[PDB]
Write a protein that binds this ligand. Structure first.
Ligand SMILES: [Mg+2]
Ligand SMILES: [Mg+2]
Ligand SMILES: [Mg+2]
Ligand SMILES: [Mg+2]
Ligand SMILES: [Mg+2]
Ligand SMILES: [Mg+2]
Ligand SMILES: [Mg+2]
Ligand SMILES: [Mg+2]
Ligand SMILES: [Mg+2]
Ligand SMILES: [Mg+2]
Ligand SMILES: [Mg+2]
Ligand SMILES: [Mg+2]
Ligand SMILES: [Mg+2]
Ligand SMILES: [Mg+2]
Ligand SMILES: [Mg+2]
Ligand SMILES: [Mg+2]
Ligand SMILES: [Mg+2]
Ligand SMILES: [Mg+2]
Ligand SMILES: [Mg+2]
Ligand SMILES: [Mg+2]
Ligand SMILES: [Mg+2]
Ligand SMILES: [Mg+2]
Ligand SMILES: [Mg+2]
Ligand SMILES: [Mg+2]
Ligand SMILES: [Mg+2]
Ligand SMILES: [Mg+2]
Ligand SMILES: [Mg+2]
Ligand SMILES: [Mg+2]
Ligand SMILES: [Mg+2]
Ligand SMILES: [Mg+2]
Ligand SMILES: [Mg+2]
Ligand SMILES: [Mg+2]
Ligand SMILES: [Mg+2]
Ligand SMILES: [Mg+2]
Ligand SMILES: [Mg+2]
Ligand SMILES: [Mg+2]
Ligand SMILES: [Mg+2]
Lengths: 76, 94, 58, 117, 136
RNA sequence: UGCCUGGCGGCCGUAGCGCGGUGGUCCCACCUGACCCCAUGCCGAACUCAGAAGUGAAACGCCGUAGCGCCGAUGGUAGUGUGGGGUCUCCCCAUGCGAGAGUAGGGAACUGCCAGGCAU
RNA sequence: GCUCAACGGAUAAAAGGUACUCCGGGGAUAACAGGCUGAUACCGCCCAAGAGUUCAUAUCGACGGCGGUGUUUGGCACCU
RNA sequence: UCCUCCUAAAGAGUAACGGAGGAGCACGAAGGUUGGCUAAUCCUGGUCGGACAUCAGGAGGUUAGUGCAAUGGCAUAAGCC
RNA sequence: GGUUCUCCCCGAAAGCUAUUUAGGUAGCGCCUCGUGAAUUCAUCUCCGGGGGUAGAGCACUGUUUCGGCAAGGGGGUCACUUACCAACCCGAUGCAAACUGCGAAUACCGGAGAAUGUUAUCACGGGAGACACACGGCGGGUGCUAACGUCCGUCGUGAAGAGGGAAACAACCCAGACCGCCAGCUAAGGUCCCAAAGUCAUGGUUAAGUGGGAAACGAUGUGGGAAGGCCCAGAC
């Protein structure tokens, strides 16, 4: 029937990009599913938020037989 | 037996290639085998007329470049979207 | 580095923000103004962004 | 899924977790005739110590290489070999086999001989 | 008269019509009618032109239509103000870019195809030209 | 050191699929037996245990092979940042960036750790 | 313990009429006329299957195409 | 009021009485963990049995499934015991 | 509605969010003044990043046409068959804001470095104003790719900006006025007279006052270019 509706935008996306130095706990990407997967020193929260488990530099990689995207954290 | 006269291109890319066609010439390329591709420029009217005979697309042609003869076959052709004109040709070394 | 001279050749009025900011970085204050700068890739890069409104002498 | 591809699937989760944890794993492989044990470094690509029933010093003292007594012998031997190299804390990677019977005989003996897990 | 039998969505953004055509060669028949200009062909236009060329050959030979009007066009009627929801779908067009082969034909002599395509072209809102099959 | 096999990784299709050939001393596999440990929303299929009569049939591994997948230029084409222009629904010029598809072509993976069998 | 859903929730508690009307304001905003537009209207043309015994275009013309006017039905809300 | 997608111009955000839908609940297991498992669809064969029930094989390979809209995820499953 | 002397410095907004709110108001954004603080910020260069847009493509989700193959359905049997329709599949061809087995330019985040920039940056504190925007360019939704229409994004200008040009003409082009000059150079735009500057030079085109309004379409107007058919076995 009638249209006219939408919902508030959820501000998903990458918060820290490659190379960026972050403190442990910092959110690196908000996403709805695991577009990105947690790599070394990176954790996955219940809404698939990836966050730093250690102080260091953000590092995006592509790994494994499925060519999946992973975010890890390098000590700096 | 078709004989095509060509010079090697001094430039490359979109700008250079459009300037060729505004000058009644058009780019082409020769590849195949051991030698490196050879970017060239052709006279439009001369090759337009030639390629209006099925033989062009099935015979061994000879391109003459700096008084050297290269034996080729026509391989692909890009035509203008709607005019009786040629935009580009691939030749493969025969 | 080696020194080049840069002159502003058109008005800054009506230009893109990034271009104004690039003129500021060159230190050009007005049409006709000539400025002595070092010949670095960083400086050449600013000249290049606003090349349509500056003249270089080397 | 055939027996093997099925087992590898059964093994993937635990191995990723151990990989994540950076653990030194004691990896077991079982066969109808033989059983094998490897202590592999966290990089996943270096074997620090190993024992199995295909090596003659071990199979020689064994009735049948493919049973529980043999499994106890292999486990005990990796443990010893491992302790002599300073290796003590590891994690068990049952590699998709049930923690049971032979695998468990191997595990129990490895612990018995001072290997910590 | 051509129309999609069903669609995912009823209505469509206006959008734009930039670019050159894909499908610029005579790929089925012997001769083709090609767009030289840019624009919209309605289903009624496509039909009017198909009829004309088909009279012209006395339903001999064979005819192909390379375009399909899959874009729904809406309109607001008289005495309605702006807004209050998007208009109602009234008809369907195909978006045409320079170079699109519109119709193909074979099984007739070239002279007759040119005539038939001449009659058809007089029904269309975009300039066209007559084209032939080409080796490669 | 060389061939062969098993395990664990790197790499993530130039690495896969198919088709043909090929291997069992060893390893692997099927296999034998099953009261029992243990198991089947039924089933010893699977999981599991005790084994060694048979076979490499299947699977697996190796070698071959361009039907397919995959990779893939050069050149042109499309788009586009900045500046300028036209007949401004769209385009053109200068400059910089420059695809996608297709073409030639590549391609029957590469590689580390440990262990076992064989040979010189 | 509130569908305080008018969902940052004026009160625990509330519908209407005014052509008998009134004040403060707005061309911030409607009705007339102007203006912009020209889908619609009106006028003209392009193609020509067909009507016209025969014959497309004397007189007309299907399916479609392109325009001109400002001129109807409207759109807008720029002036008052 | 709230959620999902597009408009939205490849970071976030972004309007209209723009284009499409959904929520105002459910669940003590439909939560936790250990252990295990793997769809759809099609072809062939098979009592009653039919285009379609349950059985077997083969192709297929997640097109299934996810309490519910949409989108993003999901095989190490997040799906199923 | 009106709000009264002078000079100087800086200099907005017409947006977000909430509002019995919508021409009101509040917080934030943007202005000013003061205090303090970092190599704080900007441009460029190199370095480290994620993209799913333009474009393309058609494996996916849909849509689409031609050909092959085909289960199935509609019709005739009194199980078999018909010039019918036929999904899937194979080959070929297009279309997509809510398609993606591809994918830019730009833009954005981060590191480092020089030059430049009257700190341009951030923090706290005193004072606000503003929350009717307009046109133009680009990318779009809506509308008819109608509107001096309407709604977002982004830049420019007007607003709050004089001067030169576009006859006149906020919003377009050039350009930013501290004051004085009866000096000089330029910008856009111009140089026969009104009217400052070429009745300039050189090679062409046009004959329509085209230039100095308007499409499909029509035509031995005329200029340039590359080919072809017939022809002294006599062509037109
Ligand atoms: Mg260019
Ligand atoms: Mg068995
Ligand atoms: Mg075999
Ligand atoms: Mg080859
Ligand atoms: Mg390149
Ligand atoms: Mg690329
Ligand atoms: Mg490419
Ligand atoms: Mg490819
Ligand atoms: Mg060895
Ligand atoms: Mg409210
Ligand atoms: Mg009365
Ligand atoms: Mg009364
Ligand atoms: Mg009054
Ligand atoms: Mg008004
Ligand atoms: Mg009026
Ligand atoms: Mg208005
Ligand atoms: Mg008036
Ligand atoms: Mg975005
Ligand atoms: Mg963006
Ligand atoms: Mg669940
Ligand atoms: Mg599990
Ligand atoms: Mg059946
Ligand atoms: Mg000032
Ligand atoms: Mg209230
Ligand atoms: Mg970079
Ligand atoms: Mg596109
Ligand atoms: Mg078909
Ligand atoms: Mg402040
Ligand atoms: Mg307000
Ligand atoms: Mg407002
Ligand atoms: Mg606005
Ligand atoms: Mg307006
Ligand atoms: Mg004002
Ligand atoms: Mg004037
Ligand atoms: Mg000034
Ligand atoms: Mg004068
Ligand atoms: Mg005139």
């Amino acid at each position: 029937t009638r249209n006219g509706r939408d919902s508030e935008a959820k501000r998903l996306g990458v918060k820290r990009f490659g190379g960026e130095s972050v403190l442990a706990g910092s959110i690196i990407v908000r996403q709805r599913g695991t577009k990105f997967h947690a790599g070394a020193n990176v954790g996955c929260g219940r809404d698939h938020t990836l966050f730093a488990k250690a102080d260091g530099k953000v590092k995006f990689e592509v790994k494994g037989p499925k060519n999946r995207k992973f975010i890890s954290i390098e000590a700096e | 037996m078709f004989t095509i006269n060509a010079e090697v291109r001094k430039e490359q890319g979109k700008g250079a290639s459009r300037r060729l066609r505004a000058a009644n010439k058009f780019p082409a390329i020769i590849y195949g085998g051991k030698e490196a591709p050879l970017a060239i420029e052709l006279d439009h009217d001369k090759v337009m007329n030639m390629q209006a005979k099925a033989e062009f697309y099935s015979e061994v042609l000879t391109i003459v470049v700096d008084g050297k003869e290269i034996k080729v076959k026509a391989q692909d052709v890009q035509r203008h979207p709607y005019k009786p004109k040629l935009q580009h040709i691939d030749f493969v070394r025969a | 580095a080696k020194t080049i001279k840069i002159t502003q050749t058109r008005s800054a009025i009506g230009r893109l923000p990034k271009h104004k900011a690039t003129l500021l970085g060159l230190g050009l204050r007005r049409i006709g103004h000539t400025v002595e700068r070092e010949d670095t890739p960083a400086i050449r890069g600013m000249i290049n962004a606003v090349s349509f409104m500056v003249k270089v002498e080397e | 899924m055939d027996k093997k591809s099925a087992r590898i699937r059964r093994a993937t989760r635990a191995r990723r977790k151990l990989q994540e944890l950076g653990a030194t794993r004691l990896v077991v492989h079982r066969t109808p005739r033989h059983i094998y044990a490897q202590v592999i470094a966290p990089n996943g690509s270096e074997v620090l110590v190993a024992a199995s029933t295909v090596e003659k010093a071990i199979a020689e003292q064994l009735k049948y290489t493919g049973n529980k007594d043999a499994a106890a012998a292999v486990g005990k031997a990796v443990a010893e070999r491992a302790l002599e190299k300073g290796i003590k804390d590891v994690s068990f990677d049952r590699s998709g086999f049930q923690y049971h019977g032979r695998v468990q005989a191997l595990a129990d003996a490895a612990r018995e001989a001072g290997l910590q897990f | 008269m051509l129309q999609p039998k069903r669609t995912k969505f009823r209505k469509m953004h206006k959008g734009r019509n930039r670019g050159l055509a894909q499908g610029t060669d005579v790929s089925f028949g012997s001769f083709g009618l090609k767009a030289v200009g840019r624009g919209r062909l309605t289903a009624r236009q496509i039909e009017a032109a198909r009829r004309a060329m088909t009279r012209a050959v006395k339903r001999q030979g064979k005819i192909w239509i390379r375009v399909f009007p899959d874009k729904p066009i809406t309109e607001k009627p008289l005495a309605v103000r702006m807004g209050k929801g998007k208009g109602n779908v009234e008809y369907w067009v195909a978006l045409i870019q320079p170079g699109k082969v519109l119709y193909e034909m074979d099984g007739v002599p070239e002279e007759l195809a040119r005539e038939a395509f001449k009659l058809a072209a007089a029904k269309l809102p975009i300039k066209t030209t007559f084209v032939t099959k080409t080796v490669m």
